[PDB]
Amino acid sequence: SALGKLQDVVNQNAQALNTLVKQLSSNFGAISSVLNDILARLDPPEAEV
Amino acid sequence: DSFVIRGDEVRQIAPGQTGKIADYNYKLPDDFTGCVIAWNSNNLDSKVG
């Protein structure tokens, strides 16, 4: 635990990046979290929503 | 834009609708501005034969 400050900074940055990448898996109330699925499944009037 | 359609097809003259005359006869844009007017014409646009 001598080098905790640098490891803390690296862990915080890596964790925040992980959180960002993980947020793509959430649909936020939509039918799917994948844009390709929505574009391949729906007409533009509902795919827009 | 003037035309004659069926009684049940008046719902299809709208943005974002799935239908037969919507796809192959008259299509409205998703961002359409304006008004649709429909009135019965059985007295004038019908014949007994």
Added chain:
Amino acid sequence: ASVYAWNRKRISNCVADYSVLYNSASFSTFKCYGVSPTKLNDLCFTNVYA
């Protein structure tokens, strides 16, 4: 079947042409919710039930 005892049929291991369903004028209502009617020929499915 009646609506209280509605018949559920499994559809599996087949290639389906849905274009003959959209283009047919026999159906008064052809309304899809989670998928576009015209994209049905471009997708693969399982757990299909009628």
